[PDB]
Design a protein around this nucleic acid. Structure first.
Lengths: 118, 204
RNA sequence: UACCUGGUUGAUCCUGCCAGUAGCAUAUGCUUGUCUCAAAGAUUAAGCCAUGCAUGUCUAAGUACGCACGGCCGGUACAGUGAAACUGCGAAUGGCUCAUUAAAUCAGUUAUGGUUCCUUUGGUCGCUCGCCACUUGGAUAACUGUGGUAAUUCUAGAGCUAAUACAUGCCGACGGGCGCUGACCCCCUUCGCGGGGGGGAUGCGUGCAUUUAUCAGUGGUGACUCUAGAUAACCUCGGGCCGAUCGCACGCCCCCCGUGGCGGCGACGACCCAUUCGAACGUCUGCCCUAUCAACUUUCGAUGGUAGUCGCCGUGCCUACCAUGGUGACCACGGGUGACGGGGAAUCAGGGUUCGAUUCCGGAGAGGGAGCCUGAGAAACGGCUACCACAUCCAAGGAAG
RNA sequence: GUAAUUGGAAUGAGUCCACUUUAAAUCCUUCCGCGAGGAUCCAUUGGAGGGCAAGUCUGGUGCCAGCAGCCGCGGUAAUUCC
């Protein structure tokens, strides 16, 4: 039973979870099911926990701080291609779009483009 | 979910009735708003059909009405002095649809100085020269004097009503239903209606 | 077919009831070759139920970036298909049963001389004077990867990305116009005068709708606090509208010039207004047995008057102050009902007696009672939460009914 | 009407294609074929005193067993019992 931001009862309480909090895929509209959750204080009774670096230290942690994995689904709206590529004005948003290459063995080599929005 | 239906009432001959169905959603429950005076917070409720009645939790201002000269302006709300149904709801400061509520004078002051140009609220003199004597004179022509010296005849106010302009606050009556609509509007007491409440307030 | 026959006696005539007779209808007994219609776990136990199920859903027209498929037929926006996911809309209908409930349910009835009600249809949707508008904003799922307990339609973490999801907000229209305020016209009686106009600089308020107050009585009704018009104001930050939407055939004028101004068909939309399917509340009238049920209701709203509270709205539906009322032998009130009501059914000289859980319409409830969110509509139960009664898994840490 | 002898442009149940119906099939409808002599390919349920149509025919029982909705029959010849 996972943790939740701000409960802090270092144990297991039961919450009435509606649509949009966490821990509950609300199986139809407006439903509020009562589900147990774990308080946000960390204890010794956890099988696993998640933990995220925010300032880089010393060494090549193998498989952790090397191998920058690309965000291969690039920006698609015409304000997020207008957010990283500095394509200012009259630069024809189509012409410097991202494209996504594909490499199946049996089929032909192809690249592949999105739609566009706005 | 307190319904307001009728199968829980004893019928006319004095014999109880047995219910045959549950209490339905089209007699939705009734939590009273009990609108009090402070800064403005308004809460919304969906009803049948999909309308959103604004309900009034805490109010400051209203849009009260002069009446005899048709001057409808805003005013902040000062105090609650008298209520028709229960004597308990004045001492918890609750704005309802028929509580005699107490507003200020300065929109009605400054309009009467604007439409007729008469001194009002200023009772002695000799403190009102630089910004406060420039309300009546304003460089009128001969013909603007012609159409504002004839406005001394339609300028009169009932005796008890300029008297509280000199003493500060108008006692009004709410006419809207706060907690159902979300405003505390109303008219201003004057006439024999004002003598009715002023009898029933002082005598307490 | 408005119909009778045997029985108290040693025989008679009666009063009587028993029995026969014929329907119809649940059940059963024995028998059963043909064919076509065809009722069928309602009578007790509205008792509990194994499992398998009974509601989900795309068109060229909301969002493709799964190589999941397709000739990429060409130097890059999408050749089209398409699992999923976001979004919408259904699931409030149908079906099942009769435990309740005896004025409740139910049925009737109400020329230019100036250049309350999603959807449906049918309107309204440049009517408002007001420094991105050739397109303004952040996040989220599918997916990639990393996980956790035995498990549940359980889901955590990291990074991506869209909108008809959630936002934010304006050119245009649009020049002005309307009402008030308020420097300018002396030509009128300016005679020391008293005057009377047209027009003005300025500064406001300006539509639909929400809320309050005032004046007059365009179209309406035995009838209006109707609709509408004139005024002075408001405009809820969990906030009203003024389309930052998607397809289809494309064509026109290209004269600033190969860049721009126009156009038709739509699909979605959109507070309002009517409209239909409705719903809820009501008016009068109508029900079975019971006096071994004659007084009931009023502390706990009982019956009326003001004023208010919420309520979609009318009202003791509440609250608060008052008044002392209301019902009854024309049977109130209480009890029973092996009572769901109605269309109707069996039977019939006329008159009736009984049945109706049952496919049509109306009511109710999904083990018992309560509480709710979402939605337009649910106090839904093939939605949830709690309790009480019943029961299931378990690695006994917890899960599901 | 027995007891008959035959029969033959007589046939249905039954077994059998095939078409048809149907969403797919089934009946059924049509249609080769086979298919009746104690046509063994066979009809029962209740009664036979009176009400109430139908028997004092036989054997057994002996107020026993039992019948009978009512009246009644039952005690060594029963129109009612098996």
């Amino acid at each position: 039973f996972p943790m939740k931001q701000g409960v802090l009862t270092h144990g297991r309480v039961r919450l009435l979870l509606s649509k949009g909090h966490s821990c509950y895929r609300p199986r139809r509209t407006g439903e509020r099911k009562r589900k147990s959750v774990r308080g946000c204080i960390v204890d010794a009774n956890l099988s696993v926990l998640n933990l995220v670096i925010v300032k880089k230290g010393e060494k090549d942690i193998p498989g952790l701080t090397d191998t920058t994995v690309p965000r291969r689904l690039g920006p698609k709206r015409a304000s997020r291609i207008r957010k990283l590529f500095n394509l200012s004005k009259e630069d024809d948003v189509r012409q410097y779009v991202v494209r996504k290459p594909l490499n199946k063995e049996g089929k032909k080599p192809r690249t592949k483009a999105p739609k566009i929005q706005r | 979910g307190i319904s307001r239906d009728n199968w829980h009432k004893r019928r006319k001959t004095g014999g109880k009735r047995k219910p045959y169905h549950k209490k339905r959603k089209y007699e939705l429950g009734r939590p009273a708003a009990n609108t009090k005076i402070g800064p403005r917070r308004i809460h919304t409720v969906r009803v049948r059909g999909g309308n959103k009645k604004y309900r009034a939790l805490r109010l400051d201002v209203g849009n009260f009405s002069w009446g005899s000269e048709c001057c409808t302006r805003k005013t902040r709300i000062i105090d609650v002095v008298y209520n028709a149904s229960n004597n308990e709801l004045v001492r918890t400061k609750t704005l309802v649809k028929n509580c005699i509520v107490l507003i200020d004078s300065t929109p009605y002051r400054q309009w009467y100085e604007s439409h007729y140009a008469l001194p009002l609220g200023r009772k002695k003199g000799a403190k009102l020269t630089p910004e406060e004597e420039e309300i009546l004179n304003k460089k009128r022509s001969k013909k603007i004097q012609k159409k504002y010296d004839e406005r001394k005849k339609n300028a009169k106010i009932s005796s008890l009503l300029e008297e509280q302009f000199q003493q500060g606050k108008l006692l009004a009556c709410i006419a809207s239903r706060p907690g159902q609509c979300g405003r505390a509007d109303g008219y201003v007491l004057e006439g024999k209606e004002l003598e009715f409440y002023l009898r029933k307030i002082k005598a307490r």
